[PDB]
């Protein structure tokens, strides 16, 4: 949730650092989907502030 | 960024085993007691002993190539000046450092 | 309506409805009295020394 | 009904104090209370990220964040404590342990 | 002309996914929107749907129609029939495969709908849409006249070089309509063109892998006691989170995506020229904005005393 | 669950108005609301 | 919900056109407050639909001539379920108790 | 200029999707996108 | 609203045009309403006549 949550050494670098606090959740009974939890894009927050 | 989400690994009337995955901020978890449904009807007959594995990862957005911020560190700055110097009716355009 | 009593109740008191009741209210103390017959006591000679 | 789940905040520990890093996806009500006789109940609807610090005593402090199940955290002697530290030093270390007095006895 | 227009479409095929609301409740519809991007400064939206369009069922270039997976079959309707809105109706600009470029206004959610041969179908997904106006002036719509400033916008060109996504074989697709109790036993059609994967939890025979054969299954009182899946194993699908994966293998590759974000030029409003009044060590400024406009000032000294304010109503400051 | 109560669960788990249970229209899209309908 | 003869037909709606009574398909009838609503069910006088927030309710339908509409002033503001104030239900979340209008004609 | 890049300029200066250049539809309204189209 | 959009269906793809103009009508009277009430009192106002006169 902070500026620089997703970092990449260079533009073309395939390896990257990610800290989004991704947490998987329990899916709904009878529904096929991938539930998840993540922090809002810190890039957008910084762009706003 | 975009949250890359893999397709659910649903094992009907059985159990899956999780394996290491080498992705940035890669998370994977096993869920039991699921009876998935599809447009064509109930996916799995069994009500118990069912396994649904969910896997997700974080990947760069496809727009990042054009819209991105670049973090730099700067030090030891130098100044370059453009002086118009006329010495005895000799007008020149001088590009010279300070 | 303002925040509910459940959120404002002191001593960490938790409020539950239907059988209106308060739970886990950590305040005070309770005296106890134990009328135990002598038949339940064990002689030292039966216990290790 | 299906309801959103308030994002899990970051929790930073300290002396008689807990630092909470809130990052809501939408306007979410934060409510806190103490487990003492004086709850000092404080609440606020927070829609923008912000870090707030609350004081926690050994009597207990409860934390509720959106629809996440309530969590509780208590506090205990952190630092500088009361070592041997001859001389001085320990005089100011004791200042932080069992306040509201201390200076009185000195 | 060129593989970008030939497209991996021939390999992919549209698919279906769950929508939160399909009108009266949820459903597994191909209209489902996977993701929405709103980085362009000009207000255009790039929606990624579960279906594909721009090419017809035979792979011919036809942008007039859109292709959606209607349950067990795949149907196509004209693209002009498809409408979408957030607060007000949007204007569709272009499309290619999974992605859709349209002019939507600001809003709290995106609703997409189209008319079938029956009651119209719609699907709404929650996503914050709020486009940043280009420039230091916060406008709702571009002005008739203005100055040209640099901006970043979503190109409608199908040309694609940078971005690509992973697509792979879909998993087994259950279909209970394949199975019935002919007289008293389980009878399953393949059907004609699809391989039928059938497995039973009860005893007897628990494996079929019937390629093409009408089989009867004893010891199964009711058709509910069996399950049957439609297997294609012909085309790839986008790595969607609503369709289960195939456990046997994940044949995958990299395929490029249209509507790349690229630099460009935008038309922006020009802040009305204020009135300037002179005085002793002081300048009086009469501001009269047409819209919320940011005023920023600074000194040229060591202490700039930087002051800024978004001013939307006329006011005079010294 | 769904909009409790009335939501007749289809075979595919979708929820329909209870007034559309056995009304002569295929609302589940798998015909399960119109199968086994009493006379 | 029922036609002029009393037969069960939810596809149409019945309106008194001055001296006579006419019926048109229900799917033609549309309504909105800030954005178009989704009709869910109906029975007799009452109508259940998914409307968004707004300051007034406008209902309209196409006749055999110029379309007819009617707006009435009524404050529409639905309380989000839970301690989190959302506009639309999330894709994922926890299940909490709520009170909602049943569509069942029972 | 227009939505750089892709906007094929018509004879009347209008901008069209580059996917509608030489697609068999008169999008410029003067036929200039469909004239001179290579085979 | 913040802008006015006008559209009509041609023999082909529908055509529309939006122009920026502030639209904000002052309610008649000392009470700020959004739509006229079912019942009320009659007060003087200034309105656009539809008459072609
Ligand atoms: C100084 O520079 C300007 C432009 O760089 C040029 O027009 C001018 O002639 C120059 N003056 C002298 C005295 O060289
Ligand atoms: C508490 O708030 C202050 C400023 O408001 C901040 O400097 C401090 O870091 C916070 N406490 C902790 C443990 O972070
Ligand atoms: C500066 O502000 C004051 C009141 O705020 C006003 O009276 C004065 O006229 C202004 N200065 C000038 C030069 O107009
Ligand atoms: Ca029905
Ligand atoms: Ca054309």
Tell me briefly what this model is.
The structure is cut from a larger assembly and holds 3 copies of chain A, 4 copies of chain D and 2 copies of chain F (39 residues). Chain A has 49 residues and is α+β, with helices and mostly antiparallel strands.
Helices, strands, pairings?
The structure is cut from a larger assembly and holds three copies of chain A, four copies of chain D and two copies of chain F (39 residues).
Chain A: E1 6-7, E2 17-18, E3 23-24, E4 36-37, H1 42-48
Antiparallel strand pairs in A: 1-2, 3-4
Chain D: E1 2-3, E2 10-14, E3 17-22, E4 28-34, E5 42-46, E6 50-55, E7 61-65, E8 71-73, H1 90-96
Antiparallel strand pairs in D: 2-3, 3-6, 4-5, 4-7, 7-8
Chain F: E1 8-9, E2 15-16
Antiparallel strand pairs in F: 1-2
The complex binds 2-acetamido-2-deoxy-beta-D-glucopyranose (3 copies) and calcium ion (2 copies).
Assess the beta-strand content of chain A as a share of residues. 15-25%
Q: Can you write the helix and strand succession of chain A as a string? A: EEEEH
Strand segment count of chain A: 4
Q: What does the overall shape of chain D look like? A: elongated
Oligomeric composition of the shown chains: part of a larger assembly
What kind of sheet is the major sheet of chain D?
A: 4 strands, antiparallel
Number of strands of chain D: 8
Note the gap between the termini of chain D.
61 Å
Spatial sequence of strands, sheet with the most strands of chain D: 5-4-7-8
Which compounds are bound in this model?
2-acetamido-2-deoxy-beta-D-glucopyranose, calcium ion
Q: What global shape of chain A is seen?
A: extended
Biggest β-sheet description of chain A = 2 strands, antiparallel
SSE sequence of chain D, one letter per element: EEEEEEEEH
Widest β-sheet, arrangement of strands of chain A: 1-2
Radius of gyration of chain A: 15 Å
Helix content of chain A: 10-25%
Provide a count of the helices of chain D. 1
Protein name (chain I): Structural polyprotein
Subcellular location (chain I): Host cell membrane; Host cytoplasm; Host nucleus; Virion membrane
Subunit structure (chain I): The precursor of protein E3/E2 and E1 form a heterodimer shortly after synthesis.
Protein name (chains F, H): Low-density lipoprotein receptor class A domain-containing protein 3
Architecture overview:
The structure is cut from a larger assembly and holds three copies of chain A, four copies of chain D and two copies of chain F (about 40 residues). Chain A is about 15% helix and about 15% strand. Chain A is built from one helix and four strands, in the order E-E-E-E-H. A two-stranded antiparallel ribbon of chain A has the order 1-2. In chain A, strands 3-4 form a two-stranded antiparallel ribbon. Chain D is built from one helix and eight strands, in the order ββββββββα. In chain D, strand 7 and strand 8 (about 70-75) form a beta hairpin. Helices cover about 0% and strands about 10% of the residues of chain F. In chain F, a hairpin with a 5-residue loop joins strand 1 (about 10) and strand 2 (about 15). The radius of gyration of chain F is 9 Å and the shape is globular. The interface between B and E is medium-sized, with 28 and 41 residues. The complex binds 2-acetamido-2-deoxy-beta-D-glucopyranose (NAG) (3 copies) and calcium ion (2 copies). One calcium ion (CA) binds near residues 20 and 27 of chain H.
């Amino acid at each position: 949730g902070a500026f620089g949550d997703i970092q990449s050494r260079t533009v073309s670098s395939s390896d990257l650092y990610a800290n989004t606090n991704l947490v998987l959740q329990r899916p709904k009974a009878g529904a096929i989907h991938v539930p998840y939890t993540q922090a809002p894009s810190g890039f957008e927050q910084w762009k706003k502030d | 960024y975009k949250t890359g989400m893999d397709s659910p690994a649903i094992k009907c009337c059985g159990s899956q085993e999780c394996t290491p995955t080498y992705r940035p901020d890669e998370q994977c978890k096993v869920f039991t007691g699921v009876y998935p449904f599809m447009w064509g009807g109930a996916y799995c007959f069994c009500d118990t002993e069912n396994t649904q594995v969910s896997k997700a990862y974080v990947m760069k957005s496809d727009d990042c190539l054009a819209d991105h911020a670049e973090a730099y560190k700067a030090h030891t700055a130098s100044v370059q000046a453009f002086l118009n110097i006329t010495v005895g009716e000799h007008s020149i355009v001088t590009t010279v450092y300070v | 309506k303002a925040p509910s009593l459940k959120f404002t109740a002191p001593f960490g008191c938790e409020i539950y409805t239907n059988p209106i009741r308060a739970e886990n209210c950590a305040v005070g103390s309770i005296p106890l009295a134990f009328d135990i017959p002598d038949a339940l006591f064990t002689r030292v000679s039966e216990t290790p020394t | 009904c299906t309801v959103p789940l308030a994002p899990e905040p970051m929790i930073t520990f300290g002396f008689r104090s807990v630092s909470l890093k809130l990052h809501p996806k939408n306007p979410t009500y934060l409510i806190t209370r103490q487990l003492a006789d004086e709850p000092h109940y404080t609440h606020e609807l927070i829609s923008e990220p912000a870090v707030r610090n609350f004081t926690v005593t050994e009597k207990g402090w409860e934390f509720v964040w959106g629809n996440h199940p309530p969590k509780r955290f208590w506090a205990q002697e952190t630092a500088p404590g009361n070592p041997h530290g001859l001389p001085h030093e320990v005089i100011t270390h004791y200042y932080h342990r069992y306040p509201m007095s201390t200076i009185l006895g000195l | 002309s060129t593989e970008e227009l030939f497209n991996e479409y021939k390999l992919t095929r549209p698919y279906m996914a769950r929508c939160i609301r399909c009108a009266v409740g949820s459903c597994h519809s191909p209209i489902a929107i996977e993701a929405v991007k709103s980085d362009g400064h000009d207000g255009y939206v790039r929606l990624q749907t579960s279906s594909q369009y721009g090419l017809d069922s035979s792979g011919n270039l036809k942008g007039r129609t859109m292709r959606y997976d209607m349950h067990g079959t795949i149907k196509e309707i004209p693209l002009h029939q498809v409408s979408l809105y957030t607060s007000r109706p949007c204007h569709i600009v272009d499309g290619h495969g999974y992605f859709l470029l349209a002019r939507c206004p600001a809003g709290d959610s995106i609703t997409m709908e189209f008319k079938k041969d029956s009651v119209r179908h719609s699907c709404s997904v929650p996503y914050e849409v709020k486009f940043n106006p280009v420039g230091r002036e916060l406008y709702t719509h571009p002005p008739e006249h203005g100055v040209e400033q640099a901006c970043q916008v979503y190109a409608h060109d199908a040309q694609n070089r940078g971005a690509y996504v992973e697509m792979h074989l879909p998993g087994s697709e259950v279909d209970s309509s394949l199975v019935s109790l002919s007289g008293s036993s389980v009878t399953v059609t393949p059907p004609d063109g699809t391989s039928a994967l059938v497995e039973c939890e009860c005893g007897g025979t628990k494996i079929s892998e019937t390629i093409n054969k009408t089989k009867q299954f004893s010891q199964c009182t009711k058709k509910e006691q069996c399950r049957a899946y439609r297997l294609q194993n012909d085309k790839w699908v986008y790595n969607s989170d609503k369709l289960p994966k195939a456990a046997g293998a994940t044949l995958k590759g990299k395929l490029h995506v249209p509507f790349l974000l690229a630099d460009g030029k935008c038309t922006v409003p020009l802040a009305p020229e204020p009135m300037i009044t002179f005085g002793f060590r002081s300048v009086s400024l009469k501001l009269h904005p047409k819209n919320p406009t940011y005023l920023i000032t600074r000194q040229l000294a060591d202490e700039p005393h930087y002051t800024h304010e978004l001013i939307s109503e006329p006011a005079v400051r010294n | 669950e769904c909009n409790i109560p009335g939501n007749f669960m289809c075979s595919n788990g979708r929820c329909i108005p209870g007034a559309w249970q056995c009304d002569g229209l295929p609302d589940c899209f798998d015909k399960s609301d119109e199968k086994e309908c009493p006379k």
